[PDB]
């Protein structure tokens, strides 16, 4: 269960690719996270986004260990 602060750290890390498309997995081995902008928020400019309203997260499990 990754904390919201750690999820926000990944959002900042991939700030250049953050979109409504699921991000790459945060790790290449083990349990990581994937993040995206909600499809229903696709038409909001970047500065009008909000973590609690507009961001989705899901767990990913990579096997390249």
């Amino acid at each position: 269960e990754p904390s919201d602060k750690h999820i926000k750290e990944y959002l900042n890390k991939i700030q250049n690719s953050l979109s409504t498309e699921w991000s790459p997995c945060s790790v290449t081995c083990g349990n990581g996270i994937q993040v995206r902008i909600k499809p229903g928020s696709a038409n909001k400019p970047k500065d009008e986004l909000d973590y609690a309203n507009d961001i989705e997260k899901k767990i990913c499990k990579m096997e390249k260990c």
């Epitope: 602060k5 700030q15 500065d47 009008e48 986004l49 909000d50």
Partner: antibody, heavy 123, light 106 residues
């Protein structure tokens, strides 16, 4: 060169009105959230108001709610602060500030700041 | 939401200055730090808890966890004397700490 230049400060009577402007250059003004911050002489920084790129979301500090109105004209690369019902305690240097943060991560900071313009509320 | 800083921190030249900024679950937020010298506009020296803008001397570092964001100046020089303000964000409201005046003694 990213630059913000405030104008409109000066002396204003108690209860009077004053409009500050902030001219932006060197960045795509129309896509950034913009902020006003003030600092009373010898005191600290106090956030005043914010407005997003499209003006769709606006917020005020409780100390100015109902008296100040923030606005912007993207075609003119300009940010405005209309100040009404001014009181002696609104005397401060008023700063224009750009927010180049990552709103999706709730990550907000100000850079750059304008040079500030001094508003003196006095009889 | 309120942020609290010590009013004054003093340090000898070349020593480390530790300036704190405190608030309820501050570590769950992003903190940034502004430097203000007399008669000048504030300048960000740390943002996003730990990030240093280009042009800011490498001796400025930052951290944020728990209920404390910490601005650390290693090998403090006289030119680092200034007021330092922390700043965070709470429900679209921007909050500033009250400021810390850094004095380089000796």
């Amino acid at each position: 060169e990213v630059q913000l230049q405030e104008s409109g400060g000066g002396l204003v009577k108690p209860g009077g009105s004053l409009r500050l402007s902030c001219a932006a250059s060197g960045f795509t003004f129309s896509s950034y959230s913009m902020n006003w911050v003030r600092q009373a002489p010898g005191k600290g920084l106090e956030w005043v108001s914010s407005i997003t790129s499209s003006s769709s979301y606006i917020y005020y500090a409780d100390s100015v709610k109902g008296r100040f109105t923030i606005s912007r004209d993207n075609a003119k690369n300009s940010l405005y602060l209309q100040m009404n019902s001014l009181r002696a305690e609104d005397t401060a240097v008023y700063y224009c500030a750009r927010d180049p943060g990552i709103a999706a991560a709730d990550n907000h900071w100000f850079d750059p700041w304008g040079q500030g313009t001094l508003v003196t509320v006095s009889s | 939401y309120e942020l609290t800083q010590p009013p004054s921190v003093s340090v000898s030249p070349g020593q480390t200055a530790s300036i704190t900024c405190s608030g309820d679950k501050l570590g769950d937020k992003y903190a940034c730090w502004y430097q203000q010298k007399p008669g000048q506009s504030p300048v960000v020296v740390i943002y996003q808890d730990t990030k240093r803008p280009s042009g800011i001397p490498e001796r400025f570092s930052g951290s944020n966890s728990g209920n404390t964001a910490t601005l650390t100046i290693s090998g403090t020089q006289a030119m680092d004397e200034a007021d330092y303000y922390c700043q965070a964000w709470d429900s679209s409201t921007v909050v500033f700490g009250g400021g810390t005046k850094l004095t380089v003694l000796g």
